[PDB]
Every structure is written in C-alpha cells, then in structure tokens.
Amino acid sequence: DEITPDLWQEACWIVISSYFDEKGLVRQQLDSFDEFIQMSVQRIVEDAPPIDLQAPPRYLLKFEQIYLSKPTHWERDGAPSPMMPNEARLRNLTYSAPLYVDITKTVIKEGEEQLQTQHQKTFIGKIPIMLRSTYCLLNGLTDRDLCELNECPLDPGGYFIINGSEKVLIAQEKMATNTVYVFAKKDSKYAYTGECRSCLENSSRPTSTIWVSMLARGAIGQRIVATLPYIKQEVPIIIVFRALGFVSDRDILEHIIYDFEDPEMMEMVKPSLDEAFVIQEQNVALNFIGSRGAKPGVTKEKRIKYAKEVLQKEMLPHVGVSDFCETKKAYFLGYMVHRLLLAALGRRELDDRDHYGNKRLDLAGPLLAFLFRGMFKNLLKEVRIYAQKFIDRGKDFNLELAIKTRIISDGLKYSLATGNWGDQKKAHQARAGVSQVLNRLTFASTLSHLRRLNSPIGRDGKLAKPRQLHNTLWGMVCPAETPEGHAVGLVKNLALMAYISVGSQPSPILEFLEEWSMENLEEISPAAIADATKIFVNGCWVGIHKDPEQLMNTLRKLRRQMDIIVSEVSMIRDIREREIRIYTDAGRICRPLLIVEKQKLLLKKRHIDQLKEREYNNYSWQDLVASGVVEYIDTLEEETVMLAMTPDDLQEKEVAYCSTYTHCEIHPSMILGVCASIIPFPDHNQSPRNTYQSAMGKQAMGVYITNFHVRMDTLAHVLYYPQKPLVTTRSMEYLRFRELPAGINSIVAIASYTGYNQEDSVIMNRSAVDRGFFRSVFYRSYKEQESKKGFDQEEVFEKPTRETCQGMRHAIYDKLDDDGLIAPGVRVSGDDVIIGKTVTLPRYTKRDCSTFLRTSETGIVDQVMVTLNQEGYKFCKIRVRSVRIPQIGDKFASRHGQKGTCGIQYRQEDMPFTCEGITPDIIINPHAIPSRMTIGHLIECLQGKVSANKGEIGDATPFNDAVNVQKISNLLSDYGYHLRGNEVLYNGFTGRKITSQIFIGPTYYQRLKHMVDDKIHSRARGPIQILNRQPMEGRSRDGGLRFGEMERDCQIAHGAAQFLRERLFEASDPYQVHVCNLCGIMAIANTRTHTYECRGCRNKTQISLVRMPYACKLLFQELMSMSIAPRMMSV
C-alpha cells in the first residue's frame, strides 16, 4: 500500500527516527576507530617487511597476530587495574590499551637448521582508545551501568582521553585517490594537466602522484609530457610507453586512442610522437628516464635498474606494484593521456576541485593508521639498530630490550595531545589542528565538534573557491554551520543523516565482475575497447563490459539486498563517456535516500507499520536497508540520480517536470547539521542569520552534560533552569536537545522602550532575573601537583608559614587547611590562596609557589579532589563555583542570530504590561529585525504564544506545508489574542496605554558564555614584559591594551602630538640612556658616582641624557648586535 500524502510526514519522521535509533550521531568516528583497531593495525604490522639482520648468522624477525587489551592502568606498584574513563579524566591519565604483538625470531647458522623462538604477546606500546568504541570499557553498557560508573548515557563518545583532556579528531578533506583529474593550470607552461593521486588500496603508504600534462602553445604542436614521481624532469609520454615495454606505435596508440577512425586524437598525439622519435628501444627509454632521476647513475645498468623500480613501484602504484603488470599500468597511463586529450579537445569537461566526489574524508581511522604506519616503521628501525649493534659483536639479543615501547605510546600520545599531526621532530611541517580539545560548553558544542570536517587549506588564502558553498554539499555537509572569520567555508559540519564510508575490500566485487561477463584488460584486444564500457574498481581499470544496463541493474540489485555489494559501495555510471566506476574506499560521504521506481516509492505502509513497533518486532533501519527500500548514495553517485524532493514530486503534474525520478529525499531538513537543526523556521531567516545561530548555539549556556558534578573541567557553565523550547523542530529529538537544553523561553516584547535596547541590545526584567531567569554557575578547576624536580627542588603541599617561606604574593593563607589545600565551602576572592605549595631551595629555605585564584573572581570552593597522577606524585584539582546572575552587558541570543547585550534591567513595576499583568522578560528593539530579515523570530514568537496557550509544543521543521503564518494566526485568534501577536501594552511608568500595539510572545532565548565580568579590564600600572619593558598581554596578566599603528595614525590625523607621546612614550616604556656627544653610541654612566664615560672616544665630559622608549634602546642595541651603528647625534 502506497503511503497516502496525509500520512507521509509521520512516515518520513518514523523512518528518520529509526535511523537515529540505530546509527546515532557520532557513528562515523566510532566506525572509523573500530575499523582502525580491528583491521588497520594488523595490516600495518603484517605489511611491514620482516627484519633480516646478518652481520655470519642470519636473524629473521617476523611480526604476527596482534593482541589488544582493554584500557588498563598500571600504578607504581605495577598491579594492573581496569581504567574507567572518569579515572583517566580526574587523574590526567591517557585512556589507552596495551597492544601486544606476536613475534617469531628464526636463527640461521652456517651448516645448521633454523631456530624458531615464539615471543607470544610482546608489548610494543599503548594505543589511545576512543570513548564508547568497541575496545572501550563503556561499550555494551546500559544507561544504569553508565550511571553507576558516573558516566553520562547521553554522552556520545567518539573522543579520546589524553592526559585527562578530551581530544576529538577533526576529519580532514583530502583529494580522492586513484582518480584521473584534468585541470587547466592557471598561467603555467601546461595548458591542461591530468593528475592521479595514486595509492594502492588497503595499504597505508603515502600517495604517489603522477602528472600527465600537455604544454602550452605560446614548436609544431601540443606536446604531452609526464611528471613522474622521483623523476625530476618532464619525460615525454611516448618515452614512458617505450620504457613500459612498447616499442611499436599501434601498441602505444591502441593503449591511448581507443577508436582509430577518430582523427583529432591522432593530430594531437602527433607532436608527442614526433618529439620522442629518437628513442625507440625499451632500455634506451629507461636510460633516458633514469638519467634525470633524483639519484643519477654513472653506470647505464644502475640507471636501468633505477627507472625500472620507479616505473615498477612508484609510477601508478594502485594499478600494480608487481611484475608482469605492464599491460594494466600501460592501459591506465593511456587512459590518463586519453582523458587529457578529451579535455584538451573540449570533448570532455575539466574536473572540479571543490566537488566532494573528488574528495575523501580522513576520519580517526585513516589518520591513526598513517600515524601508526610511521611509528611502527620507527619501532622496526629501532629494533634493527639494537639487534645489529648486538650481533655486530655480541652472541644474541633479547628482543624485549630491543622493543622501544615508548615509540608507539609517546608518538600517539603526542599527536593526539598537541594536534601537530605526524612526528615531533618535524613539527614545523606537521599539520596542526587535526586533534582538538573537545568543546564541552553545551551538548550542541559537543555534537558539533564530534561531527566536524576541515579543509586543509591555508586560512589566509584570498581565493574563495574552497570556501564557497559548493552545490555538492547537499545533504552531506550543513549549508549553514561554518565559522565566521578566517575559517569561513573551510571548517564544516556533517548533515544529520550523512554517513562517511568506513572502507571495504574490493575483492568480492572483483570475483563477481569476473564471473559476470567482464573481459579483463589482460585478455582483450584494444579494438574491443572503443564501444565497450570501461569498468573501474577503486580507480583501477579492471576490464570492459558490453551490456551496461544489465550490469548496472545487477550490481544495484545486489547492493539493495545486502549481498556481495555492501551498502556503502558506490557505483557510478557515466553514460556519456562509457564508464562504470566502483568505489569501495573509505572517506566517501553518503546519505540514505528512498528508492523511487516507476514513479512510485518502494517504501510502503507495511514498513512504517513494522517500524512503529521497533521495540517488539526487532525491526530497525538495517532491515529497511536490507529490504531494498533505502539506499546510501554518495556524491559521485548523486550526479547520476534524479532526486524527488518530496513524494509529491512523483505525482503527475499539469506541467510534468520529470517522470524518471530515481530516488527521493527522506526529508529535506536533513541537509542541516546539528547546530542548524535547533533553528525554528530556518527557511524564513536570512542565511547569514542561520550561520550566526549555528555559531552562537555552541556558545549558549545550558547543562553541557549530565555528570557535570563528577567532572573537573577547566571552564564549565551550567544554567539554573534550562527549558526545552516551546517551538522545536523534529530534528531536535535526535540531538537530545529536550534532555540537555540550552536556553529559556522568554516573554519577548519587540518594542521601543526607553531607548536602552537600541543597536542590538535587550532590556531584561530585573524581577524575572531575581527569580532565577537565566541565572547560572561558572565552574573553574585548578590543578596542581607536587612535582619532584631532582633531589633539591621538592615542591610539597604544605600550608605556608611566613617564618620559613619566601617569594609570596603577600596574601592570607588562613583559609588553607593544614594539608596545604583549601576545603569545599570556603568563599574565595581574587587574591586568595587555594593551594599551598612550597619548593625546597638549595633562612628562607622554602619558596612559595602557591596556586592563587583568578583575579577579581569571587566564588566558593565547590570540590577538592586529591589523587595520584601517573608519576605517583600527589595531584589535586579544585573546582570553584561562581554564581553568575544576568547583568548589564551579558550577551543573550535568540535562535535566529539576534545576539545582543543586556542594556538595562527594569523591575516588574517598571516594565510594560499587558492587560493580564504579563510583563516581558526581554524587550528587543524593532530595528534589529528589518535589515536582518529574521522573520523566523517573529513566527517563533507567534507559534510560541499559540503553543503556550494551547499546551502543545510547536513544530517548526523548516520545510513543512502544514505550518504557515496564517494557520498560526488563526490558532492564536482562537484563544482571544490578536491574530498577529500584537497586544495592548501599558506604560509601566505612567500606566498609560502605548499607542502602538506591541508584538509580544514566548521566544527561546539562550544566554551566551560572553559575560561582561569575564571581559572587563583596566590598568593603571603593573606588570611589564621582561624583554621590551612594555605592559603585559591580556587581562589575565594585568596587561595593557595595544595602542597599535592605526591608533597612532588616527592620533596623527588628530594632530595630538603630546597625546601621541604620552601613549607611545610615557604610558608604555619611558627610559633614559646616556649618549656620547661625539660618536652617538650609548655610553657607560655610573649615576651613583656621576662617572659618565664613553669608550671608543675616551670621552668623560661630553655625555648627554636622552629620553627614549625602552623599545628604541632595545632596537638600537639589536642593531649594534647586527653590526650597525645608530649614531644618535644630538646636534
């Protein structure tokens, strides 16, 4: 039974609820880490070459089955214990599991057999385990089991704990591998170039890129050359084909030009043939390539070996890295030249760099695999160095001494802790920001950070193309959620139902293709290629097929029933160019779409009925995937589908747009991400306001996680009374926003009242604020440890007495206990002491290194936690709690980018009131609406008034025909209110009716983290910097403000030269030097004895006092260090 249109909204939200019941929101991180742990680590260990060390007896070291434990902690006693995540968070431990490998060492002796020794389960390092993955201790636990462990069942996981810090791996957008991309190089010697970032699948090795370029016109014609890897000059492509073992010309041109009746391809290969005519033999071509390699050879034989290994293992590794694969590599190189000729003729079109069919997403899996590949190569290097150092002189080596277990452990820990991704010794060339501290400010921050993508493009680039909202981001990437400022359009977020493919083996597809009438490339004449469809599997041309209807239909039928083709395998057919491309690699981003066949959905009422009882049929999303109803479509495959926005598009129209829809959208509001799905009516807002709300819903204040009392976070914000919104979208159920909400439903009058809400400000109700409206707590945690710095410097938690301790900040230690720490319940102030630490120096033996509270931060010690860190030292964390009452200057925002600061607070008797005595909680300016065009704000106020009168929770899903302004207006008029939300407000000061009628209603406001008391700063004088003797940096260091260069220019244009001197000389760094009146160099000046002396002149009577900035003295002394003499001549 077809789903009738009156049931379709319920049906699509039921199937969406099934998707978010099974998959969840952080599924891509957990899937990538699980596939890294299960498959990638073992592949890296096995694919590493065995260590063959001979001085002599020969030792063969082979690595075998890996073993991974659960995350365990070893204390200083050495006793293992199961490490829970809260213990790792509190004690600053790295939540890692030990990795045990099996090693086999075989001994070979002269005239003697092997000796095989089995070091079973050898410890080689600790892998940091991602939270709530398969190998975490929280896996498989229920909500009660998680609450017994003081964990949050709503906490998504998907992050690591490194030194007690939650780290998220941001996905990185790499270019897709094994795919020929042809671009016209801008202002270069090549008119068109064709590249292939070639990399052999399921093997972590760096990609080897080959370019096949075609030169610019301004010789006879157009020359195709080849920029090979490790060949530093441009080899002509015909010479490469000769070096591959093809002397003839029908061989090369049958590999390149598949149809011989076509003349233009021949007329363009003619200059490339005729420029490389003088080379006619294979080894002559090998010599011609190897003569221009990175390592040339004096011997011709060495050059032949060099060119052979370059063309064997480096030039196109994905098609073949082994011998006898010259025909498949040569067909792929001919395909690259063919695509270059097609694009240069204009017959084919140039590739787009911003198309996410051309881009893969390195998640935690591939990134950690790249790390572990490098670090296991380092470990094997260390083992071979140790064992070679022994077997050079010594009899034998014990292997457990050769295994440097710090390599894997500290390398993974360093890269996950600092975010500099790679090796520490090359940190300047390492990409940063791959690992980030997980944002825990609200739950929306956590989910948005866990679903974040990054373009590895410099943020100073003035080109806009990677920053643009490309058309192919539909349904994969949120169109609204992006940062403002230098990272706009580069840092992105996934949409709600977007899933990133985890990776699959190409093999079963290859056997199926072999037994389904595909003719291999190695067993065909090229003359059959010209009318047959080429088949690519993971970018590898594997054969041709002559019936592409039945092959594509068979492949789609297999994928739709969870057979040989798994669900994430992408199968694109390019009809116009006769190609079938099958991609199984990781990093492809896809989304589920309903399947439409013969203008009818395959999703029928029986599926909805079975999903309605998901708890008691065991029916789920995966059964929909198995039923051939939904289908995962990625970006390249979305270029060949015909989408229906709604099933109403499938209905026959009076002007029929399309009758060949292939798929249909489940709901279009799944193009939005996590933070843009909180916006009510996003389609009624201007898109900059949607982006602004996507930014500011991460800075809102709510309850960031349920177990916030256990956690010692450095900064935490908890709202007193978070409310779920009265006007929600249906996507907000799967973000768990009505369980960890981040705002309050205010009564907002959009009115001009007293002028204090002008230019984005708001007027709050003082009486409402007194009742807990937007009241919150700020938790700040301080950590301190008794670090043992050698034998002398012994820092200890002792309550400091002035009789024995020096170096104090002269503050009272009376609130400290006798264990050196403060205790919970004590009020503290900005000068007070919370940790008393004393270091023993070699009367004042002890120096005071006490931990002081942050300046001007009133609070009460909420918790003190005392533990032992990984090093066995005493370690303490103190959480201080400060109640933040809403105040003038605190930043409040609605869900429509209507941010502002509280400009004034009026009491209840002062704020305007309706005839029922309802005063607004917030008053915003009318002028904040018109140029902003946030009509979603007005509709949210109207719908919230209707929902608060009716008792419902209003639905504001973006694209919903069942909800419109007229329907809400009629509903509001049904409750005795004006239909457009206006009310007759009375002046609170005079009692008189306001002549205009004020638009008032419940609107969901959120309180942002940007409070004024966390930003107010002032200075008279204080700390100066060490080097330049200018004031310090920031309010945390009691620093000064920068009177920068444009302020200097403005004061020049003012003509205020004395104010310019006061700012740039007196109020920054006044100084006096003594300058010789002859040479102009600064002179020695004993001001105690009035002994002024200038060496270099022997001058003692002509010395002058010169007032300068200290930075000018520092500059002039750096210049005299630079062998430059600034001779400051006073005449």
């Binding site: 002397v247 003839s248 010309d249 029908r250 061989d251 011989f260 009746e261 003349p263 233009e264 021949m266 007329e267 003619k270 043939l273 005519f277 006619q280 003729l345 204009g346 017959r347 079109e349 592409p548 209807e549 009809i575 116009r576 006769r578 060949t640 589908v641 015909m642 399309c658 009758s659 060949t660 829809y661 292939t662």
Partner: protein, 116 residues
C-alpha cells in the same frame, strides 16, 4: 575533411609524408625502416577553424537511458517515429557559442540523433 594517420607495416610504426620527385608523387615513407608506401590522398595536414558544425559524432546514443536527461514528446524520431526523445545541449568549450538542442531517440536500438 580530416585525413587519418598512416602506419608502417614492417616495424608496426608511424609513416611520414615525403615527396618523391622521380615520379613527382607523394609517398608515406617510414623512417625507422626502409618501408615506403604511395599515398591515396594528397592531403597531409588539414585544420578546421569554423568547421565545427557537426557535433553529432561526439554524441553517443546511450544517453537515451539517462534518468537525469530531459525527455520530450514534441520531437518525434525520423528513423523509427518514436514519440519519446531526450534533449540536451553540446557542452564543449567549442559549443559555448551555441545553445542548440541535440535530441536522441529514447526507444531502444534506434539511436537516431538530430538537431532542431
């Protein structure tokens, strides 16, 4: 129009034009070996500048099965007379000057393509 390449038969390679003044004729003489071959056509190099009027050889008939390509019923086939056709444009750089519709017959095994 365009004249194709000529290939040597002995060493499997390209031929090259040459003018033998003994007969004062044109021969395709390979220059890897001693193979020679007289030429049927005197045209050696030929170029097309505004002769891009024939976009139909670049069109393959398979595009009748594309679900994303637009179908019309107002342009019937000349060969088989089917009502359904697919219409598109030529998408080359050498066809930016034109927005001419090219039509391909939707019915199987026909494959007839036309313009206007």
């Amino acid at each position: 129009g365009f004249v194709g390449i000529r290939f040597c038969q002995e060493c499997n390679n390209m031929l090259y034009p040459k003018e033998d003044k003994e007969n004062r004729i044109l021969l395709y003489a390979c220059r890897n070996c001693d193979y020679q071959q007289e030429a049927d056509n005197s045209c050696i190099y030929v170029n097309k500048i505004t002769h891009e009027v024939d976009e139909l050889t670049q069109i393959i008939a398979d595009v009748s099965q594309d679900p994303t390509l637009p179908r019309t019923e107002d342009h019937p086939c000349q060969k088989c007379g089917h009502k359904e056709a697919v219409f598109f444009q030529s998408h080359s750089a050498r066809a930016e000057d034109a927005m001419r519709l090219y039509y391909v017959c939707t019915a199987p095994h026909c494959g007839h393509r036309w313009t206007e």
